[PDB]
Symmetry: D3
Subunit: 178 residues, 6 copies
């Protein structure tokens, strides 16, 4: 079953969502789910020797301003394999514009890693880690000649509100589309 | 096609079965196949810095007392990726109770690694390796507060008999269920 | 969707094809797509301590003389995961006979790694790298007692012509078959 | 120069010490510095499929009740190679008895990873992480038949006091010894 | 023996030098040789999720404007371990200022990897690879608040001339110093 | 201290020797100890996509017909780092001629991995594993144009006798040499 159309957004939306991981932490290959088929696809190789600082993917049954599912970043100690489902607790949101599109990204922790039990909001994350994530998104497209802008971070409530918006964007798109 | 409902238990049951691997040797992440969809899911992160000592997964079209497919452990030199099918020869069985449920696990070797050609029964395995596997299952849930009990090991015949039982448990469950 | 029947051979055949990777560079496990189901399967473990020198897989909706999809070798800096789709530019072809069957293999580079932007034909590849690939295929089955013969390399035009042949072999097989 | 006799305990003892790492996080091999020569030696392979949860090593020019240098555990995101020096800030201490010997171990963070800038005492560490470390030391020798006892954790002051003791134990031993 | 004072700069200076690697390609940890002792030391963890794109280290018995040995970058397919000696052929030089100091870095290939046999000058390197290296050095200190400037690349002759300068800087420093 | 001149051949020669590992299992880089300095050096990159099937190194204070220390192969489950000392039990010997020189290699197991407790002679090793090792040494230099010949395997007694010969070759060489 298609993990973008056929998985729900989460088991307890918006406090607990499913993250479908595309890119394990540590990868330079920018994988994306193929919308037509369900398979993992190489979108491109990053043009700089940078690596994704988080397990990176989508919330199923969401849509967003960049014409793709809403993006989620899960902090995993051991990275997962692509196309793994993680039950994830949103704790904040990175406010990014990407090539002119709103392209904000939920920051979340795995519900079922007790290391993160006390991580509940954006203030629980080491400041240098938030900075490292923002800096990656600030610079990783510089050699492609594409502009990104990072505004800062929102808290868990702002993240949850954005998840609800993205869920409605999917309904609107694929009530008529798929 | 669903690798739990749509793969057969094996090509020459019970002497050769299919193992659908969920967890590569060396992982601390406890992946499981999602029964509803077919996708890999993070069930939890082990609560201790322990790693699966075997490639760990299921026999398709089986069921078992813990309310999930029957568990199989494949000794792979190079671990496989999750959701890989391995043709596996049962050589023994670990007798485990897990949280009060019978939860025995086949020990098997890959048919198509010649390293293991002479591994045919539980006496062919290094004793310290059997001990390491049992000890993992004895201790890996201690910080979750869940009880496990390891009784010892059975031989290849006992493993094969248990495979036949698990195959019938699936028929009984999913002749009415799925 | 089945990535062998349900993916097209490519977006701009034969100059740009899809490669569906089975084996990441660096693996000793010989994975293959299961034709019946779509899942990754362990075909065998190489009998020697050799590793695939390329990301290795198939072109979807192709067939070939060895009774399987046409083989493609993609030069990836960071290997991909099995069952990843790569948009690939053919640059040459390895002329191999395998156990008596024609079993030539496209050599390609990822379109979306700028490292390879100037790799367009077989003369762009380091000679020692072509030699390493040929030598692997020359020797990797010696302990299985199976014969392989490597004739040399063809250029990108010869590769493209062979892709068109393999695409027609699939139509012929699965217009009546699947 | 010998990194046990010829490195000082630290640049600002006891608030900043040198950790000479023997074992990278994730290893099952229990490496130790060879006291006679300075080289890394395999002391043993852990008897269970457990891995060191921390970068593990010694403080130079220390001695301790188990007849070896005082042990230190450094929390590194990317593990270091054996025999690497890390400038480390003690934040707490694990109170362990090992085979009847006092064998407490400093817990420290790297001074020069900004991720850890706000980690200054034992209360800054996720509780589940302290539990995972203690559990490892509680169980990792069970198959060797050797007893360990973990009493709990002390704070950074208690750790610093123990570092000063271990430094004096070295002076006493190797004022007459080496 | 100290691999900075006791190794020569090379076997056929300046056409073939020794590179003493500190940092394997793919590392985020910035290791440096400890000048006082000879041991590997963690200088810092990069503040961004970037990795060294090359095997990175020093030419022995050199000195440079940043108060440390002259830097060399070796293109290794399989990264080496820290403190490994590589016989390296200079092919070009990255013109970098680092925090106000001249801090140029030789780009070299291993003499004894035949993959690189035809890499002899800066024009032999893929343009995107030179860009990736420069971009790393342009951005990797942005979160430390330290300025770097990359001027571009020089050819193999310019690299060789700079090696000869750095060799004389060591003689001048350590004819009086060490 | 130099781990070739300053380590003894073993603690209980010839039944237990020291192996000083140069090459971890899985490496394509052929590292060797530098005789002049003690440091690890890249001797060459293998010309084929083959990997060392064993942890590979030397017995200290030995010499041999190829003008270097006597070679030893240690079967490690988790490979060690270069320049690690392993206490090793010889179980057999590979009879190799390399470029015209006798170049036999001890096969050994780690004393302190209980997995190998019952491995005491060449008959204890899986036949396919001996074949894989021999095949590697048969083929790995084919692209260098250098001849190797593998005669077969000797048992543990023959290995032990060869260790005693190699120890005397060192005395003869470095009673006058070093
Ligand atoms: Cl992205
Ligand atoms: Cl389990
Ligand atoms: Cl193949
Ligand atoms: Cl320990
Ligand atoms: Cl640098
Ligand atoms: Cl060799
Ligand atoms: Mg995108
Ligand atoms: Mg996205
Ligand atoms: Mg975007
Ligand atoms: Mg997006
Ligand atoms: Mg379960
Ligand atoms: Mg299970
Ligand atoms: Mg269970
Ligand atoms: Mg179970
Ligand atoms: Mg095949
Ligand atoms: Mg094929
Ligand atoms: Mg073939
Ligand atoms: Mg084929
Ligand atoms: Mg000890
Ligand atoms: Mg210790
Ligand atoms: Mg101890
Ligand atoms: Mg101790
Ligand atoms: Mg520096
Ligand atoms: Mg430097
Ligand atoms: Mg600098
Ligand atoms: Mg510098
Ligand atoms: Mg040699
Ligand atoms: Mg040797
Ligand atoms: Mg040799
Ligand atoms: Mg030799």
């Amino acid at each position: 079953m298609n993990p973008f159309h056929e998985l729900e957004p989460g088991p307890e939306v918006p406090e607990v969502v499913y993250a479908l991981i595309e890119i394990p932490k540590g990868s330079r290959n920018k994988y994306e789910l193929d919308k037509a088929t369900g398979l993992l696809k190489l979108d491109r190789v990053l043009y700089s020797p940078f690596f994704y600082p988080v397990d990176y993917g989508i919330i199923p049954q969401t849509w967003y301003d960049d014409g793709d599912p809403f993006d989620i970043m899960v902090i995993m100690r051991e990275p997962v394999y692509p196309l793994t489902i993680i039950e994830a607790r949103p704790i904040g949101i990175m406010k990014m514009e990407d090539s002119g599109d709103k392209d904000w990204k939920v920051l979340a922790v795995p519900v079922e890693d007790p290391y993160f039990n006390d991580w509940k909001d954006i203030s629980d994350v080491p400041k240098a880690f938030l900075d490292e994530i923002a800096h990656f998104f600030q610079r990783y497209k510089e050699l492609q000649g594409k502009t990104t802008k990072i505004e800062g971070w929102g808290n868990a409530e702002e993240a949850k509100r954005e998840i609800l918006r993205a869920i409605e964007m999917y309904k609107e798109k694929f009530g008529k589309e798929e």
